[PDB]
């Protein structure tokens, strides 16, 4: 229980991500993240940048082709009106970086769920700079209960889904172009 689980790629789906959410218990804002590695490359965890919110687990360290990683986060605990906003960075065996943005706001009167995926040339750690590119400059997807596809370059693509609520799930599949 130091890291999030690694499961058979084919196992990843809505019910797995709801089980992850349920284990966090009834906190106001929380996310279950599932990324299926069908990239044909091994991933090695770099880091998670939390702009807001926290996790009691670290990224699964090694995620082979054919494996999905499970991850989670939740709002900072106590009377702060914040959500859970951060960036996951994995190193790929080609020397590049797979980056995932998740954004779950406190106030749905004015803000909505957002996610993003991208491949960076070389070894790039998750930080505020990467958050700002993925959020403000690289056409994030809305957590609109819709599936979205994108060509990542570097011979990969993504297909993913995020729901629209404060109890958020983010399912992503990286496959071969």
Author numbering: 3 to 179
From the paper:
The structure is composed of a β-sandwich core flanked by an N-terminal and a C-terminal α-helix. The most stable isoforms were FraA and FraB as judged by their higher TM values (TMFraA = 65 ± 1 °C, TMFraB = 62 ± 2 °C), followed by FraC, FraD, and FraE (TMFraC = 53 ± 3 °C, TMFraD = 47 ± 1 °C, and TMFraE = 51 ± 1 °C). Differences in the exponential dependencies of the lag time on the protein concentration distinguish the more cooperative FraC and FraE from the other fragaceatoxin isoforms. The overall hemolytic activities, however, are lower, implying that protein flexibility may obstruct other steps during the pore-forming process. Given the high sequence similarity between FraC and FraE, other possibilities such as long-range interactions may help to explain kinetic differences, such as those described for Stn-II. Similar mechanisms may apply to the arginine/aspartate difference at position 129 of FraC versus FraE.
The steps leading to pore formation comprise (1) the binding of the toxins to the cell membrane, (2) toxin diffusion across the membrane plane, (3) protein oligomerization, and (4) translocation of the N-terminal α-helices through the lipid bilayer.
